[PDB]
Ligand binder design. Structure first.
Ligand SMILES: [Mg+2]
Lengths: 155, 386
RNA sequence: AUAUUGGCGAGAGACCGAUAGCGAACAAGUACAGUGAUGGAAAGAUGAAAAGAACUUUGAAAAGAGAGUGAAAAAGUACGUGAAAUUGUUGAAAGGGAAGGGCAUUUGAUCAGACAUGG
RNA sequence: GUCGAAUUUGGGUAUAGGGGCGAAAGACUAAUCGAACCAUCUAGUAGCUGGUUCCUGCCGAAGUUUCCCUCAGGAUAGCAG
RNA sequence: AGAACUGGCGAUGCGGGAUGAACCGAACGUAGAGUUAAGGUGCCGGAAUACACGCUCAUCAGACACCACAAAAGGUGUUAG
RNA sequence: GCCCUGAAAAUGGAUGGCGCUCAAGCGUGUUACCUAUACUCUACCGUCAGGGUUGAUAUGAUGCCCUGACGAGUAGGCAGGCGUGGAGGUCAGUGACGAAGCCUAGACCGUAAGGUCGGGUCGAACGGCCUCUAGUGCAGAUCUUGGUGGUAGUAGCAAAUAUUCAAAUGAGAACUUUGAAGACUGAAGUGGGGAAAGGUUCCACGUCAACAGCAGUUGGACGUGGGUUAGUCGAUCCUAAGA
RNA sequence: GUGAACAGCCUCUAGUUGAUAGAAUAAUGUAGAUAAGGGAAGUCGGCAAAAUAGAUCCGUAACUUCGGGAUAAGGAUUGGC
RNA sequence: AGAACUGGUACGGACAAGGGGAAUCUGACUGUCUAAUUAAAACAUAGCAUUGCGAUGGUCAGAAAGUGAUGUUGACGCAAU
RNA sequence: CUAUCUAGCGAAACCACAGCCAAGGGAACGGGCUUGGCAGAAUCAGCGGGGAAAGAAGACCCUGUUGAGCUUGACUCUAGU
RNA sequence: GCGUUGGAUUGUUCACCCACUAAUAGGGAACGUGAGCUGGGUUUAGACCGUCGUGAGACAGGUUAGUUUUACCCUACUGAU
RNA sequence: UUGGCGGAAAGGCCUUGGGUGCUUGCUGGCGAAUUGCAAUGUCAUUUUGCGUGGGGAUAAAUCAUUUGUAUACGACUUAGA
């Protein structure tokens, strides 16, 4: 408990977390935003296709030097990619949430992702050896991911 | 600081920037001065460049070591089926330039052209000029009005024509559409000619004739990203140079403190627009003619098509223009053949040619025979046959 | 009677308060380095009490979501408070080769000072 | 380049810092050499370089004199509180 | 580069000289109203595209102290003597 | 006198710019107009000066009151104050019904150093006044120690010929095991043993958080165990340079 | 096995197939090749490259410390049966 | 070693494997050194020459010594250039 | 084989604040100031003009009442003899 | 507006000859241009000589050998979305 | 509503014929206050979301796949009911 800022009816909502996960903070940020406010199954379906290389994740912030793809066109963008490890972890969290929702008997068909937020876990430090007898840091930038699914309210 | 020796700059700054052309169909940017005293006629034509071959002819040029003597010249052949007229566009003069006021189109358009208006034909509903057509319903007015508007205002008049690309070996089904200025006389006469030709066909032999000098307009063959050396013809640096030697060593003096628009740099080479002038017509082919490729000296029955077929193109089954020398663009590419913006009197330009012989051996290797008939005569019987 | 930065036993301080105070408040002359003489750190704080999360559910698992314990989990053996740099998300706003500042006012937001006179 | 000897090389042993060792380059003596490494004397001295931490109020300079192994420094008088 | 007297800059903002340590004006608590300095008043820009007598036409005119240079020498250009 | 010739330099460019020709140019005259932290008059802050006033009569005599003048400032001198650790004294000061601390384009006082309040968070101590005392106030010192950015998902992860099909196992297989294929080291070995050195890395079972700069079910890794058998092989004895 | 051979090249025994991977094939590179005609004109300088090369038989200058120079130079030859 | 036959005249067919000549400066040669910018014409060298010394000695070591190197030596030797 | 594009993995240098010019003046060569030219999101590969780019408080020079290595009929000594 | 060259000797700029040619003008851009090259000359440390000096060393005298680092950032420029 | 004219960016202009409101050309009958002596007192035109009733119309582009006239990646150019 204690997620970031949410403004959603907790009674119509369910949520999931993952902490100290060894995936790229920057890549997974980019992909969390890719499905933000999405209806869960659209999200689910799309992420499955990004694995299949049929659509992609737009890279909007952590993105300089990244190649260009025709697949960014959809999202008005030139620079997108296919972050498998990120997609994969986000899927696990979506899956969990979805489980938690069923347990609360929320309507699977009304569910959209109402909150999704990656921030930065503590780094994991390894060493690289460099020319002239030096050492440099070779680190991991792990992620904390949290998200929330909620029932869309009706007319 | 005063460059030690002097040399001319590499490359022409009048052909910048050296980028990819906007369209693959290079634009006609000038049509000939109009002489409104003579029959309404097209001022250019559209074709597909098919390949090159070789000619022999006597030269006619008093005072040349080669007068009254055979010379042998490269030619290029461009596949030139008839062009169909499907619209007229009228232009007015303004203090801001020529401007189009309307376009009036033909009642019926073929799929070939209609296809040019779509990116996904297979799955479109092909609604292209379907409401426009109905403008013909009414005994005329809507159409007849706009024709009248072009007569009243309108200062220059172009027809819209397209290629019949299906009459051509090309895989491409989408035809090429273009405006061509009508130079024959009188604005009113122009639009009538145009009206009368809607949906009708126009052949090259009504535009161009033997001995004529004509211009070619075409996008040049692409080559992708080039280095400085081949892109600009900059000089190789010595073998000894560190970090590579296809460069220019000095990109600039210290001031102006900015690399300047005139130094040579790597980037795109090819796929540029070129208007190439002064290409003499050496043949106007008839497609119905089974002796296309023959001469009053070489009496044999043969078509212009090489043994084996034009490499990377196929056969020539239509009217065609044969032009001396060479032309920008590559095989398969659309070319606009434009008439001269001027009255050349060159002597070279006035000469009337007559071919004596047209090469027809295979261009797919060192071909030794002009016709299947000649080959069999030479080789005698094989193990296939009979 | 005098000396006494050592040793043993004691009483103290207008001394320092974990980057301070001895190098060491801790398995510190340790871990580690160096052939060697030598060099030599970092490192304290869940809670009154482990009551350290039974059980259910999702997951290959780590874990998540519930539940439960507790005065508190805005204390979960990453633990008291938990600043700054720097970061994610949310909300508002501006942005034709920097941004920031001064005097002034428009506009938006926000906050006031009133206080009492017969019914 | 040399490649059967003024050859190459293991281990053992000896030479120690104004000392060694040098078919001699001031070379080599544990990534150190025109004097090794370690600790202490040692917080070495510095007319030179850098920095020197809250606010407001009042007054407010000098780059000149004389003397100095004085000339990027002092003392002396002046100006200032 | 080096002296004399004074005034400055340095230690000092402000108004003018587009700009600018040193020129011109003028030295400074926080403000209101008025008036000026040096400098300006076609438009940029606050302020007469004001008034008056001349002079000047440059196929390289000219346009304001310090100040951002010009000379000898020539002209049947035009002016007045 | 004005004008013209005399009058040649390097990126494109400067009466400040536009542009101006009975001028918006040059000489001269006359009015009006614009505008500085300057001048004039007034309010307020402070500084300095002069003067009055506890004579009995509530609350500051280093006070209250009246009057005139003045205000630039580096180096630097002096003054009056703001703030911190601790000390004597005092408010019989605040506090678990919430101390201290922290956060807050919320509020109020002060020219300022600062002080005060609300709200949030928090959990055990703390403050005002008169004094005493200093290890007492940071932006800088290529300052010290720690922590963090942009750089950047970037440079890169290209020497040593080379891999492929299938099955098995597994949550998961480009990378494990088995099979098949294709190849390499080519006995001057990528074979089989040792010396120095390491010290358990050997073998088995289990097994992946970390480590093996992709991966991992694999390992020289992690956990738990097992293992080195001498009259004859060495040391041991001998002597060598030398100690 | 080839061959003068403990060379190079290919093999048997034994051992490996381990040194991120996928898709492309722009410039510029790093490493490996080739170029018509000319032939050092390039350049401080033939730097870099190229050319020669094993064996058999012929032949072999100046000079010389009489040992050399000398594989001097210059030529023919070379498989299979 | 010889001969006949044979081929797109090829045949040390891959691998392997000296370019040559005429001179000038310089060091005789083989050898040596600046580990990590200098391999050289620098150092060495054999050869030549000079110097000291007959041991109660020459040259060198040590604070000193019943101390030490040459010396298990003796001028065809040791030491110094 | 790289570069390039993709999955996984993921450093460093450097950083007052920043990043379009012309002229002017100015510590006499401006990204900033003054006057003009101008000026439109977000970007990819290349590039070597500029950032008087970046790497060790300048190797050269001078100053300092700062050294050290080395030499000598400088000054003052000393083992030895 | 447009051209202004090919060579011999020299590290050279310069100089000087040969030769072609329409002509073989002169200059600037941090004496343009080294994260563009090269490294021949200068100007560290090796070394020979001549002059100088008792010597260590010195020479604006000759001679030989002597490590050329980084772009992935901004801007500019080339091209590309 | 009858005719016409206007393409420089015409997008507006002139015209014919009636209908309808108003008519301050002129003569009457009413009304206005207290909004308290000024202060807030005439509504303009842009977009954009919704609301009703009528007329209307009934597509493509992108990804993926594919061509190679194209290409570093994007991009380009082809093909597919
Ligand atoms: Mg004057």
């Amino acid at each position: 408990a204690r997620y970031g800022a949410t403004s959603t009816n907790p009674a119509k909502s369910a949520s999931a977390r993952g902490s100290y996960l060894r995936v790229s903070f920057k890549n997974t940020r980019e992909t969390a935003q890719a499905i933000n406010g999405w209806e869960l199954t659209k999200a689910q379906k799309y992420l499955e296709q990004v694995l299949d290389h049929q659509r992609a994740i737009p890279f909007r912030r952590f993105n300089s030097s990244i190649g260009r793809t025709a697949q960014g066109k959809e999202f008005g963008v030139t620079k997108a990619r296919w972050p498998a490890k990120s997609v994969k972890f986000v899927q696990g969290l979506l899956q969990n949430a979805a489980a938690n929702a069923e347990a609360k008997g929320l309507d699977a068909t009304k569910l959209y992702v109402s909150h999704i937020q990656v921030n930065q876990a503590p780094k994991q430090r390894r060493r690289t050896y460099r020319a002239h007898g030096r050492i440099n840091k070779y680190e991991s930038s792990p992620s904390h991911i949290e998200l929330v699914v909620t029932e869309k309210e009706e007319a | 600081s005063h460059r030690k020796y002097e040399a001319p700059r590499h490359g022409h700054l009048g052909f910048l920037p050296r980028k990819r052309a906007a369209s693959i169909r290079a634009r006609v940017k000038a049509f000939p001065k109009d002489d409104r005293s003579k029959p309404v006629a097209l001022t250019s034509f559209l074709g597909y460049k098919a390949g090159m071959t070789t000619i022999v002819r006597d030269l006619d040029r008093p005072g040349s070591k080669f007068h009254k003597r055979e010379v042998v010249e490269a030619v290029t052949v461009v596949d030139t089926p008839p062009v169909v007229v499907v619209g007229v566009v009228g232009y007015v003069e303004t203090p801001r330039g020529l401007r189009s006021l309307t376009t009036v189109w033909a009642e019926h358009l073929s799929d070939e052209v209609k296809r040019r208006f779509y990116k996904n034909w297979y799955k479109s509903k092909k609604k292209a000029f379907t409401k426009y057509s109905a403008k013909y319903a009414q005994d005329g007015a809507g159409i007849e009005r706009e024709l009248a508007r072009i007569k009243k205002y309108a200062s220059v008049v172009r027809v819209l024509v397209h290629t019949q690309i299906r009459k051509t070996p090309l895989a491409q089904k989408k035809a090429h559409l273009a405006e061509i200025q009508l130079n024959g006389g009188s604005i009113s006469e122009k639009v009538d000619w145009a009206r009368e030709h809607f949906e009708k066909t126009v052949a090259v032999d009504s535009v161009f004739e033997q001995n004529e000098m004509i211009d070619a307009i075409a996008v040049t063959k692409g080559h992708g990203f080039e280095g400085v050396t081949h892109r600009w013809g900059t000089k190789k640096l010595p073998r000894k140079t560190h970090r590579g030697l296809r460069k220019v060593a000095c990109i600039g003096a210290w001031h102006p403190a900015h690399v300047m628009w005139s130094v040579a740099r790597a980037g795109q080479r090819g796929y540029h627009s070129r208007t190439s002038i002064n290409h003499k017509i050496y043949r106007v082919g008839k497609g119905d003619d089974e002796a296309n490729g023959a001469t009053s000296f070489d009496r044999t029955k043969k078509t212009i098509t090489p043994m084996g077929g034009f490499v990377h193109y196929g056969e020539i089954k239509n009217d065609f223009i044969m032009v001396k020398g060479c032309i920008p663009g590559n095989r398969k590419r659309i070319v606009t053949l434009r008439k001269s913006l001027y009255t050349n009197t060159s002597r070279k330009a006035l000469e009337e040619v007559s071919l004596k012989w047209i090469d027809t051996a295979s261009k797919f290797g060192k071909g030794r025979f002009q016709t299947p008939a000649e080959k069999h005569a030479f080789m005698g019987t094989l193990k296939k046959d009979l």
